Design a protein around this ligand. Sequence first.
Ligand SMILES: [Ca+2]
Ligand SMILES: [Ca+2]
Ligand SMILES: [Ca+2]
Ligand SMILES: [Ca+2]
Ligand SMILES: [Ca+2]
Lengths: 34, 146
Amino acid sequence: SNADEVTVGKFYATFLIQEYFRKFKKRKEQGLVG
Amino acid sequence: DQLTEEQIAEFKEAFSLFDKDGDGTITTKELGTVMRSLGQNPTEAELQDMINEVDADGNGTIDFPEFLTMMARKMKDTDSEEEIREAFRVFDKDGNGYISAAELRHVMTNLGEKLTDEEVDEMIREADIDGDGPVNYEEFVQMMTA
Ligand SMILES: [Ca+2]
Ligand SMILES: [Ca+2]
Ligand SMILES: [Ca+2]
Ligand SMILES: [Ca+2]
Ligand SMILES: [Ca+2]
């Protein structure tokens, strides 16, 4: 298989996606006191 | 170079997505389950190849030190185009070259992000530079770039 050549890209992609959501949620919530 | 506790926490959270049973190692079985939930259909050979690429001690699974070594090394690369392309493909599961609100919602729910419906609309809108509705690849690249 040649899947080894895109393996790092696929694991890093899910980090990029989780970060995309995290940064959005952080911007939304910042400063709120419940 | 620096690897802060926050950066490690982000990489641990990425690890935890694939570590479905929470036992501290990623198996081929877990890898394939997650990849199918993300809209892909890799073969057994492709999954084992991916495990083997990261499994530095060769015991057949990926532990977090192995995962962290791989992710920290990729972080040092100044070019992220391949990773952004792969991230686009996760969202664009029907392969038509744009991300719809439904596709973003699907990834959101699979990652347990707990966005409100209005928040889903907002993420799509804020990425939709040309205003035609969905997020195309160029728009996705511009948003994901550092
Ligand atoms: Ca291979
Ligand atoms: Ca596991
Ligand atoms: Ca190992
Ligand atoms: Ca699509
Ligand atoms: Ca658009």
